[PDB]
User: Which sequence fits this backbone?
């Protein structure tokens, strides 16, 4: 039912189908499916405006793992967890995301685009 | 602004801050100017635009901290003004989340 | 050398097949077989240096041919040709006779041909690269134990990689044209930037050179961190060769900065660069 909700793009309806799911393991799996498909569909507002609760830690773990997993330029998951932190008033936590991603840029990248971005991240935190 | 050309407003403001205009008692007003741009409930500015905007915001912030004294501040206005600073940057960062989600969805 | 210059064959190339058809070596079915049989036969060689040269060159040619040939393919004689070539120290022969001659600076094409020969040698024989690396390391071990016991290194010494280091270092102090072919050995994946390097991808994310030069400069980057003391100096000839030119100098500066900092592998005279 959830995946069909995805197929015809009823995102709120998919969210409700997900909230229906009892098992936390399948909840995490379908959460990963949801995040991947929404990212590829450029449906970002969905991810934030989701009012998750008690699934916040599942989403946090998923997004941080994918941040470990993703390219810095072709993927924005650190910024997504950022905006999540804002959406949940997470001052210290959004700062942590920014400084961390600035460190990651300092490691991976030595380009001027990087330079702009490390400055952005350290400053933001 | 009174006729609501916010884009050129931002252009002029960015130009004048990167010009670093007006004395210390008036970079007060330079800082003060950003409030309606904060008040934007709908924006058309680029993510890079927001970048340089906030860049210069805290750039001038540190600069104002030091213009007062090279390691201190002594102006009577700063304290409560600093409070406004925190609330305004609060609103800023929330609108930054808003602008970035819009811009990312703008690529849809 | 130009006639044998077939450098497109190292990896699969889109133009490789038509280069094959308008190449004489393949339109003559008797070409490759004829030279292979003749070289494996016995011929006068007034200079073992050039004899080793020709054996090495035909071996690299057959090695390149084999990866995309099935009836003009030879890979059996390459190994003995290569062993004869390295044993005859073709490296020093070419270092002295050709490069030492200032008749060799007449055309840029000379430099180009030697440079692609240089890039050709390791990519085709990675097994030989590893074998010679280990053999140089064990040579260092033998010399170390001989000095410890107060004796001389056992038997004879083979220093072909030493010859290569000396040769290429010497090579890249000799160019009027400033071809910057050493910048190839400086991949732009290496973090380095200047007020002219914005046209490069070190101010913009990501750039990957061709596989052969990536392998070469990468093997260089690891040799920055693994060294036996017997090869310490010819490797330094690498260094002074590459030290020519401003941008290559900046790249080598970056590489030694990587070799800089606290470590345990640039602090050693064996297994790393002291």
Assistant:
């Amino acid at each position: 039912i959830f995946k069909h909700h995805l197929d015809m793009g009823h995102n709120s309806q998919a969210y409700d189908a997900l909230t229906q799911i009892p098992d936390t393991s399948r909840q995490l799996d379908c959460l990963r499916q949801l995040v991947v498909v929404l990212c590829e569909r450029s449906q970002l507002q969905d991810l934030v405006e989701f009012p998750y609760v008690n699934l916040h830690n599942e989403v946090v773990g998923i997004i941080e793992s994918r941040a470990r997993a993703v390219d810095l330029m072709t993927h924005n998951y650190y910024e997504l967890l950022y905006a999540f932190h804002i959406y949940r008033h997470n001052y210290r936590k959004a700062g942590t995301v920014m400084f961390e991603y600035g460190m990651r840029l300092g490691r991976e990248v030595r380009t001027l685009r990087g330079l702009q971005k490390q400055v952005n991240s350290y400053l933001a935190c | 602004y009174s006729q609501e050309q916010f884009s050129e407003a931002a252009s002029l403001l960015l130009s004048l801050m990167t010009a670093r205009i007006a004395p210390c008692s008036f970079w007060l007003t330079l800082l003060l100017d950003a409030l309606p741009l904060l008040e934007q409930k709908q924006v058309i500015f680029s993510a890079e635009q927001t970048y340089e905007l906030m860049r210069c915001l805290e750039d001038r912030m540190a600069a104002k901290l030091e213009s007062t004294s090279p390691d201190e501040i002594q102006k009577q206005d700063s304290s409560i003004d600093n409070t406004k600073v925190e609330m305004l940057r609060l609103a800023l960062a929330r609108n930054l989340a808003r602008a970035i989600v819009t811009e990312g969805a703008l690529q849809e | 050398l130009y006639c044998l210059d077939v450098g497109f064959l190292e990896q699969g190339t889109d133009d490789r097949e038509e280069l094959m058809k308008q190449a004489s070596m393949f339109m003559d079915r008797q070409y490759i077989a004829a030279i292979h049989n003749r070289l494996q036969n016995t011929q006068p060689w007034k200079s073992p240096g050039m004899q080793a040269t020709v054996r090495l060159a035909w071996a690299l040619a057959l090695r390149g041919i084999s990866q995309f040939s099935e009836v003009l393919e030879f890979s059996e004689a390459d190994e003995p040709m290569a062993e004869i070539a390295i044993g005859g120290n073709v490296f020093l022969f070419l270092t002295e006779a050709v490069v030492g001659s200032e008749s060799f600076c007449t055309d840029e094409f000379f430099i180009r041909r030697i440079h692609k020969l240089v890039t050709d040698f390791p990519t085709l024989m990675p097994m030989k690269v590893k074998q010679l690396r280990n053999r140089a390391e064990e040579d260092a071990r033998l010399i170390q134990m001989s000095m410890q016991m107060g004796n001389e290194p056992p038997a004879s010494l083979r220093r072909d990689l030493e010859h290569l280091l000396l040769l290429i270092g010497e090579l890249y102090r000799k160019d009027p044209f400033h071809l910057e072919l050493a910048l190839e050995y400086w991949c732009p994946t290496e973090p380095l930037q200047s007020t002219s390097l914005m046209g490069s991808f070190l101010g913009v994310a990501h750039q990957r050179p061709p596989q052969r030069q990536v392998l070469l400069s990468k093997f260089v980057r690891q040799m920055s961190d693994l060294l036996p003391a017997t090869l310490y100096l010819p490797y330094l000839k690498m260094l002074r060769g590459l030290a020519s030119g401003p941008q290559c100098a900046h790249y080598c500066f970056s590489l030694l900065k990587a070799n800089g900092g606290s470590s345990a592998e640039n602090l050693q005279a064996a297994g790393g660069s002291p």
